[PDB]
Amino acid sequence: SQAQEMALTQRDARFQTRHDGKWATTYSTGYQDRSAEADVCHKYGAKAVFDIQD
Amino acid sequence: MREAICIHIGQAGCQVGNACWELFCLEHGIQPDGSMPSDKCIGVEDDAFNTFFSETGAGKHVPRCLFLDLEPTVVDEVRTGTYRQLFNPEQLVSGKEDAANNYARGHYTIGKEIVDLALDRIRKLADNCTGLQGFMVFHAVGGGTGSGLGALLLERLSVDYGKKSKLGYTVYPSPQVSTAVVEPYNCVLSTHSLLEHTDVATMLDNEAIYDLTRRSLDIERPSYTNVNRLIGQVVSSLTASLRFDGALNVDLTEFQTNLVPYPRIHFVLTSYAPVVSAEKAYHEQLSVADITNSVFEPAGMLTKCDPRHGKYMSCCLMYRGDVVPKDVNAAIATIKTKRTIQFVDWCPTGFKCGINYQPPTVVPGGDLAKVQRAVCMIANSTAIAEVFARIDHKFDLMYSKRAFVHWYVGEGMEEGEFSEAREDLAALEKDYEEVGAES
Amino acid sequence: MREAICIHIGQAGCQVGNACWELFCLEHGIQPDGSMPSDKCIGVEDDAFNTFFSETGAGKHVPRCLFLDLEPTVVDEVRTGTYRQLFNPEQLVSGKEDAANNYARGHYTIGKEIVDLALDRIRKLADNCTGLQGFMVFHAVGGGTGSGLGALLLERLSVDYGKKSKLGYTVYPSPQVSTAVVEPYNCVLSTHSLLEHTDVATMLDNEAIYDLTRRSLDIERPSYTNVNRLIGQVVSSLTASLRFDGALNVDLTEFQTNLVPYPRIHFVLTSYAPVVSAEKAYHEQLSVADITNSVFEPAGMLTKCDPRHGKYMSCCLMYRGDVVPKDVNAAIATIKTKRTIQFVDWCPTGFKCGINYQPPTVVPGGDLAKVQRAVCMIANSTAIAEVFARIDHKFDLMYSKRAFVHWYVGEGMEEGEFSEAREDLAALEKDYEEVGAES
Amino acid sequence: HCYHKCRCYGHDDTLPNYKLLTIPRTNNYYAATGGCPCVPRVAAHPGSWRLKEGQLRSSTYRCGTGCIKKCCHHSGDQYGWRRGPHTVLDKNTAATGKCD
Amino acid sequence: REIVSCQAGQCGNQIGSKFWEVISDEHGVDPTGTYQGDSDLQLERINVYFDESSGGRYVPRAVLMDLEPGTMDSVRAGPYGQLFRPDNFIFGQSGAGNNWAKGHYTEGAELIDSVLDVCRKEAESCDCLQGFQLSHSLGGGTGSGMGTLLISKLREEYPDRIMMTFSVIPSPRVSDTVVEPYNTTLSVHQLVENSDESMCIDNEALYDICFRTLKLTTPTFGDLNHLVAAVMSGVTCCLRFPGQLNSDLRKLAVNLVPFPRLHFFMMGFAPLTSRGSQQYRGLSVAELTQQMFDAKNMMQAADPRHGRYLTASALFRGRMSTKEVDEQMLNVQNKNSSYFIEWIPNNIKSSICDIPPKGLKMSVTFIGNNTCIQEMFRRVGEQFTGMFRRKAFLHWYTGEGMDEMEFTEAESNMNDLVSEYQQYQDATV
Amino acid sequence: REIVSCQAGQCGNQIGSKFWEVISDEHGVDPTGTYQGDSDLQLERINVYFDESSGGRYVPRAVLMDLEPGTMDSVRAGPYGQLFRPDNFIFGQSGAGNNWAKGHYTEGAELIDSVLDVCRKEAESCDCLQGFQLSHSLGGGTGSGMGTLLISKLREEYPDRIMMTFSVIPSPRVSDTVVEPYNTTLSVHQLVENSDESMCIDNEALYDICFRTLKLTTPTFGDLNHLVAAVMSGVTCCLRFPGQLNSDLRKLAVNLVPFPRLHFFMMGFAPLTSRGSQQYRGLSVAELTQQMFDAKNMMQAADPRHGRYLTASALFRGRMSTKEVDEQMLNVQNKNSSYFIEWIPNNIKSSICDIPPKGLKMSVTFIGNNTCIQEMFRRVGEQFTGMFRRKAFLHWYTGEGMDEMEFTEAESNMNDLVSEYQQYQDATV
Numbered sequence A: 001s002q003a004q005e006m007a008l009t010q011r012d013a014r015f016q017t018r019h020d021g022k023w024a025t026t027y028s029t030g031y032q033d034r035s036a037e038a039d040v041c042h043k044y045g046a047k048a049v050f051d052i053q054d
Numbered sequence B, C: 001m002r003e004a005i006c007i008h009i010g011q012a013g014c015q016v017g018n019a020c021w022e023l024f025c026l027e028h029g030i031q032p033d034g035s036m037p038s039d040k041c042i043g044v045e046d047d048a049f050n051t052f053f054s055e056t057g058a059g060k061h062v063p064r065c066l067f068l069d070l071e072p073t074v075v076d077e078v079r080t081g082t083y084r085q086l087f088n089p090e091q092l093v094s095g096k097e098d099a100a101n102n103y104a105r106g107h108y109t110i111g112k113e114i115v116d117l118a119l120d121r122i123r124k125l126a127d128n129c130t131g132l133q134g135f136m137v138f139h140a141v142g143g144g145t146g147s148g149l150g151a152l153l154l155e156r157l158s159v160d161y162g163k164k165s166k167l168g169y170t171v172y173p174s175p176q177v178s179t180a181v182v183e184p185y186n187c188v189l190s191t192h193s194l195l196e197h198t199d200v201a202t203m204l205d206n207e208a209i210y211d212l213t214r215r216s217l218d219i220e221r222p223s224y225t226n227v228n229r230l231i232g233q234v235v236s237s238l239t240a241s242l243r244f245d246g247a248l249n250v251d252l253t254e255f256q257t258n259l260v261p262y263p264r265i266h267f268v269l270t271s272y273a274p275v276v277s278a279e280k281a282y283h284e285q286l287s288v289a290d291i292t293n294s295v296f297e298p299a300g301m302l303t304k305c306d307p308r309h310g311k312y313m314s315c316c317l318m319y320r321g322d323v324v325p326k327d328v329n330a331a332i333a334t335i336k337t338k339r340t341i342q343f344v345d346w347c348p349t350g351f352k353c354g355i356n357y358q359p360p361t362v363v364p365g366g367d368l369a370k371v372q373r374a375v376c377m378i379a380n381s382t383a384i385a386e387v388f389a390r391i392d393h394k395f396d397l398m399y400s401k402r403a404f405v406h407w408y409v410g411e412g413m414e415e416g417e418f419s420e421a422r423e424d425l426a427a428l429e430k431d432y433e434e435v436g437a438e439s
Numbered sequence D: 001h002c003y004h005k006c007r008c009y010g011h012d013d014t015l016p017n018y019k020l021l022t023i024p025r026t027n028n029y030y031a032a033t034g035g036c037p038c039v040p041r042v043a044a045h046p047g048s049w050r051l052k053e054g055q056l057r058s059s060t061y062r063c064g065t066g067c068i069k070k071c072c073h074h075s076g077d078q079y080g081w082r083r084g085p086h087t088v089l090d091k092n093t094a095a096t097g098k099c100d
Numbered sequence E, F: 001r002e003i004v005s006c007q008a009g010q011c012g013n014q015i016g017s018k019f020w021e022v023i024s025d026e027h028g029v030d031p032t033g034t035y036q037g038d039s040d041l042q043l044e045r046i047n048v049y050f051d052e053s054s055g056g057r058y059v060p061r062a063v064l065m066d067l068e069p070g071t072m073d074s075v076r077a078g079p080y081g082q083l084f085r086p087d088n089f090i091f092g093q094s095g096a097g098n099n100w101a102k103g104h105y106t107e108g109a110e111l112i113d114s115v116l117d118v119c120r121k122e123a124e125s126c127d128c129l130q131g132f133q134l135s136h137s138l139g140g141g142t143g144s145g146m147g148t149l150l151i152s153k154l155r156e157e158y159p160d161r162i163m164m165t166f167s168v169i170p171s172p173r174v175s176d177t178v179v180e181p182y183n184t185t186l187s188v189h190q191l192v193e194n195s196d197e198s199m200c201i202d203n204e205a206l207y208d209i210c211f212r213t214l215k216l217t218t219p220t221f222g223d224l225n226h227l228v229a230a231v232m233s234g235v236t237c238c239l240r241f242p243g244q245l246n247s248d249l250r251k252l253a254v255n256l257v258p259f260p261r262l263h264f265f266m267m268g269f270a271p272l273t274s275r276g277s278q279q280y281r282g283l284s285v286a287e288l289t290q291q292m293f294d295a296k297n298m299m300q301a302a303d304p305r306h307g308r309y310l311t312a313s314a315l316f317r318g319r320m321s322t323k324e325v326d327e328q329m330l331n332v333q334n335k336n337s338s339y340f341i342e343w344i345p346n347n348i349k350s351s352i353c354d355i356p357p358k359g360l361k362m363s364v365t366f367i368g369n370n371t372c373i374q375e376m377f378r379r380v381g382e383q384f385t386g387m388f389r390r391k392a393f394l395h396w397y398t399g400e401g402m403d404e405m406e407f408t409e410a411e412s413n414m415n416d417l418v419s420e421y422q423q424y425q426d427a428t429v
């Protein structure tokens, strides 16, 4: 229902803001979704053509 | 192929595994959602992630990991953290009540109500790997879960998987920095598993890492996050040979054979260099000889044990980046030349070298700095007997008047377990000295 | 052609049939009301529905099933439910008084005066059917009409329908939890008919189904609805070979003769996988080998008995979906190597394979995730003697003091019947043990 | 000795015998052994170590006692369920069963 | 599938009045008789307790009985008192005199013919009679005596039919009668012989549960009868409403009565909480089971910890999960082995009804065949023996022609009841 | 990891009321039980101390005990008194009379039936009970008698479950009772066997801390209870909130109890500073450790300088890494080797939590098993023998069923504990 959807969105917002302002863990501080700010070399790696199965 | 299974035990294991897996995801371009959106440098369906990530019908790259802890704090915060989608809801299992730094409690009472499910999940993971290299178990023996449940898991894995490789990244109680008081008891009691069911036991004590970070990374305040990032860097350096291409590719058994001279002489210290800060990095030309010398120095070492008090038995070097084999050859030549570090007489070569093309990946927002080349040494040496001869001395001082033994004996463990562990450890110092003795 | 008359006895059978029909109608494209769209002259272009539904003199589809209950609540709920128009007004036999969890009441007093009317309806169904493969009975041995009246109905079906296959799916008392006190008596007495007047009987105990839902479907508070949905999934997997195109067609007689070595030994233990929740599903690569391993694992078992404690005698694996002989044979070869599972020395083959191209369907509001492939095992193994030992030990405890026997006497049975039931269950354990013995 | 073994420390390092799993858990088995197939009712909280040790015999298994000093040894009996408090009378058990 | 109820005496009539209040409220029936519900399920099985009339009225299948007519004005003066047929009111000029002899042999006999005529009327109009229910108190004259006479005649033509009796066992502490032991002893053997099952409600226990758990300051006779009415409404919930695991009176009797003479049970209702403690309670099974199996919740003043549970029945009503309603019972059986008899495994039968009582989301009624039932029979047996030893108040029973032997016969039967409870409690595997 | 709490006597009731005030303030709970926190980390582990009703109200899992209903009335009328369950208060008609005999054998023993009923209800409702919690004073009658009786009858039912007690050890310098040594002696020997670990509180040391450190002009029982409440909340910081280095009550027992009899700790809190010096104090963890090991900062009146620390535990909270929680421990270990014990290397365990108490950015709670803890046991011992030799104030105890043999055994057990403490203090490697 409309009220249930608003409550669900409110809980989602609370879950998102769980770690904003003097309530935050070391995991939250040092473990973020910052995958877009990493420059990684990807021209060296195993091509892995030969495999087996049973 | 080349798959490897990572099992993290206890709070220390989970904390290390968090950094290890974020660094692996940054290596392989995998988001916490677990996808590969678009990469021009990546070839069509290139799979260098197969060692640590398994493909899923959803296109996801699920880690080949198993998190354990007898209480759900770290497990729940990981389940609600950034990598919710990356990590399976299973494979990240927890108990309900902690071991409370009790080896007996974690090995006989609380560990046994979850070790069965741990083996079930490990078997499920191993069924998906057709080229399983081995298991890396990350734990600290100074705790309850990591000691007891870790030992139980290793003992069961030995019979469940035969002669598969075991690599135990163990955090012993450091000579001065140490949290628990029953920590010497836990470390001494967990010695049998590390002696028998672990093929290679690598040292990652906290005090040496603290000294390394304060003296070389020039940050007044590193933390468990920083030490776990360094440990993850070490693990990635070890596994890079089987992950990516390189001039000299070495596998788990490949360095196992070269590093283990005798059936249980497999407790090995760890070192890594160049560990460098952002300001430090871009003013030095980090030559291969310089970084190798920094590795062999006893200040850039991740284990608090001075090598000058022992004989080097076998050193395995893992180079990453643009290293040419002549640089490492000259490093070996000058290392054999220099006298303040001494090798054992019966091991003339005593050196294994593995060069990997891809350099280490910096983690901005963490602590490391981008470097064109790096090297991690795993060294079996007789100097590691000092930490054993200190921990057993602490055990004797604690156990002389039966202090803190009622907690252990009330959890279904016999009193003779302490004596058996003490005798086994004593034989460990004895045969370390024996192999260190000249012919 | 290829018709299979479905029978539902008692509340358990009726609700299982309701959850089976909500699946069959949806899978074969029949509306819950049963009628066709107004513009379409024919509701379904093909006659794959023929085995479960018969089209009527208005064009719409009535199911080839009978509901039967001595109490009117469940059948009246079916009458007033969303399938009020699909089901025939007859073939929905209702009594004015239940059996009160009493086998004697269901078999000798109330059952005898309604069983002939039930057989009249069944005879009309069989006359409608032209290629009857057999009967598909669903009930619970722990109830009054489910056990006694189901037993009487099975006896009359055996005497009147020749050797026609009579597959049964019965809910047994659980090793841990029960909802009745006289349930052991009812199960012991029903094992008479289920031991002589049925071809293959399927264990469907609610404790193992609850465990399946809890560990896999991630339902913290599952119910009879979810349990019956899983049962309907199992039944559809068994029957779909004759409804959809498949690589290895398997029929009722096929898998009833490839399953039982002796007339007395016909009680089979069944499991279904991959039973996973939606969150589970997009994290695992549900391959043929993985689903086969999950099926053979007791975790995926639908019966609270550990097959590792016995010896397998005949496993019929019904695969659905994008499965391939490229992989099913490989999974079989690598699972025969596993030594938790183990076969009697006199049955080396022990495997039947039926491959169907149609993947499982999804019921609205159901907790079953959409899987590209699935597999259901029908396994006759000697490990089934455990539940019989438990149930007739409870019978012995309840029978030493002659407790509750007065109800059965008042509903019209001899105490010699209790004695013979106990003796025959003891003999059943004896020859289970004998056939588990080696040569 | 000088190096304590898995048998010394109480855990089996060998593959268990599987005939002890082949053997059925029959009421005849319980009558001859002493106990009942009835699951043990223990005064325990659900999902606890106390409940698991009271209900399963693999939880409290211990291979040997102490050091060995103070055709190999094989196990496989600890897998199953703890036995009930009741005793199975012989008269409830059949000596022979009808089969081929 | 439909049952017919009878209220006997002052206590029985007043209890049945509020029982019918609860039933009509739960089925959406007006106090006048017209249907004013908002659901189909209310009217689906309304024939279980009601019969449809000429003008669409819904008349309870109830027979009202009392030798005292001075108290049968109150039953029609109650809010739902105008629901019953005028011809189902049976009265006598003088009261029973608190005399079992008068209520069973002299005054009740002249009044029992019309009562049986009304009962036979109801049974014949009834399509498939599930059973006869009776509500009465054993401490009275026309409740004990006339009620036992009624059930005795009922067995003469309906042997297999379920005889529910909600007998009110009087308690010494809340006693207001001196011929209390005499009436209770004279009625207990008739209850044993002529009742498929008979649950015992004790006024002391009712007062205590209203005083502590409900904590409400003034629980009168109406408030005491409210709990009994709730238990009666919950014992037949599955006959009138659909459920995941339904049941009926016969099925509960089969799952609760191991031997023919062991048909005396303990009643319990859940949840029951005070007004103040209302915010602080969690509404789940993990709280319903605590209240239900709690010592203070029983409506019989004999603590169930005396003996061991022969059988237990849990009629749960509302929105429950079936595995969470059965694993709670598994846990209690697993962890309370000392209070459950060993040679009868799986002593608890759980049944589920989808529709809860009106005003309640979820509830449960408890039926326990504990061996502690012997406690009330004892504590009234010593009183009866002390009274009988000195021939106290026997002329009031022998003036009706009833001889002194039947006191000894009733004592023998009652002692046999207590002895068989004790022997089955002490029975070993 | 549930902790189910209990308060005994008026001292224990006030201390527990303040403790629930602090816990509710930390977790964002109004006196009406509603939640208005700024983060979901409160509701993540809110279960550890509170239970949620189906209506969302959070009720403490606390059981209140006092033979005087006035204490229950005062607690209920307190600012946070509407939080507790109305049926979780248990009261008697007559008070303990400041008598251990009355509180343990005659009057307290009667009311422990209902105490255990509610306590077992709450303890079972826990999904996995980590431990029991108790707050009381050994100088009183209800706290010393009923508290020890409750712990005795709870150890029998939950053997391996952890048992917290916060016992207010009285002192002659703050003496306000003359049966003080009798009650203390009679309760110490019970707490020795029945408590796995127990740390003591002295109003002398609380008053001294308030006067010299907080510099409160008029310190009150409210202020002392606030200090005890803050530290008793900090002892479960790792339980209630995620941290870098987690710990639990069993972990504290394992790392603080070398021998079963030696579990009497001396405790403290940090940081503490006066109102006029809050802005001048540089809150660094080195300063935290300095105040933590400062003798005057201990809230039990016995100078650690006369003894040696068997073990110590520092539960740090806030944004902080591991070297401020281990390297200064190394510093204090090295520069106070005479203040520690040689045969126990690493006397001090450190635990880290990521959520500091609100109003502070970092804090620490200290729990020390110093060998000087037996000085109070000495002084109470000769205090007890002073009246025991002259048989003073003994008729009150002997008139309630107790005998002189119990007093002799209690004194012998206390002296044995004292001797064990002294011998482990002066023992050599």
Ligand SMILES: Nc1nc2c(ncn2[C@@H]2O[C@H](COP(=O)(O)OP(=O)(O)OP(=O)(O)O)[C@@H](O)[C@H]2O)c(=O)[nH]1
Pocket: B009, B010, B011, B012, B013, B015, B016, B069, B070, B098, B099, B100, B101, B140, B141, B142, B143, B144, B145, B146, B147, B171, B172, B173, B178, B179, B180, B204, B206, B224, B225, B227, B228, B231, F244, F245, F246
């Ligand atoms: N390198 C590293 N070590 C850690 C970390 N966290 C904890 N430890 C080690 O864990 C030791 C303390 O053990 P515990 O607190 O009992 O943790 P545990 O070993 O996982 O065992 P339990 O938590 O009791 O189940 C310390 O001495 C640390 O060396 C970490 O994040 N990084």
Ligand SMILES: Nc1nc2c(ncn2[C@@H]2O[C@H](COP(=O)(O)OP(=O)(O)OP(=O)(O)O)[C@@H](O)[C@H]2O)c(=O)[nH]1
Pocket: C009, C010, C011, C012, C013, C015, C016, C071, C098, C099, C100, C101, C102, C140, C142, C143, C144, C145, C146, C147, C171, C172, C178, C179, C180, C204, C206, C224, C225, C227, C228, C231, E244, E245, E251
């Ligand atoms: N799997 C499953 N089992 C059920 C279901 N309903 C009832 N049962 C089983 O049936 C048992 C209860 O007895 P019933 O089968 O309902 O008895 P009945 O067949 O209706 O016969 P009567 O007792 O005379 O009414 C329970 O113990 C359940 O195991 C259901 O919906 N699904």
Ligand SMILES: Nc1nc2c(ncn2[C@@H]2O[C@H](COP(=O)(O)OP(=O)(O)O)[C@@H](O)[C@H]2O)c(=O)[nH]1
Pocket: E008, E009, E010, E011, E012, E014, E015, E066, E096, E098, E137, E139, E140, E141, E142, E143, E144, E168, E170, E174, E175, E176, E177, E203, E206, E221, E222, E224, E225
């Ligand atoms: N619970 C309850 N008990 C009642 C009620 N009315 C009477 N009683 C009990 O019944 C006893 C009197 O019995 P009575 O009704 O006079 O028997 P009768 O003369 O046969 O109708 C008293 O001891 C009361 O405790 C009532 O409305 N509720």
Ligand SMILES: Nc1nc2c(ncn2[C@@H]2O[C@H](COP(=O)(O)OP(=O)(O)O)[C@@H](O)[C@H]2O)c(=O)[nH]1
Pocket: F008, F009, F010, F011, F014, F015, F096, F098, F137, F139, F140, F141, F142, F143, F144, F168, F170, F174, F176, F203, F206, F221, F222, F224, F225
């Ligand atoms: N910290 C603190 N101590 C208190 C408080 N109230 C009383 N006390 C102490 O408790 C002791 C008396 O306890 P008492 O009232 O006799 O306990 P009771 O008999 O169980 O009620 C005194 O020595 C006080 O120091 C309080 O609010 N806070």
Ligand SMILES: [Mg+2]
Pocket: B010, B011, B069, B070, B071, B098, B099, B145, F246
């Ligand atoms: Mg931990």
Ligand SMILES: [Mg+2]
Pocket: C010, C011, C071, C098, E246
């Ligand atoms: Mg039914």
Ligand SMILES: [Zn+2]
Pocket: D001, D002, D003, D004, D005, D008, D067, D068, D069
């Ligand atoms: Zn040995």
Ligand SMILES: [Zn+2]
Pocket: C393, D035, D036, D037, D038, D084, D085, D086, D087
């Ligand atoms: Zn048994």
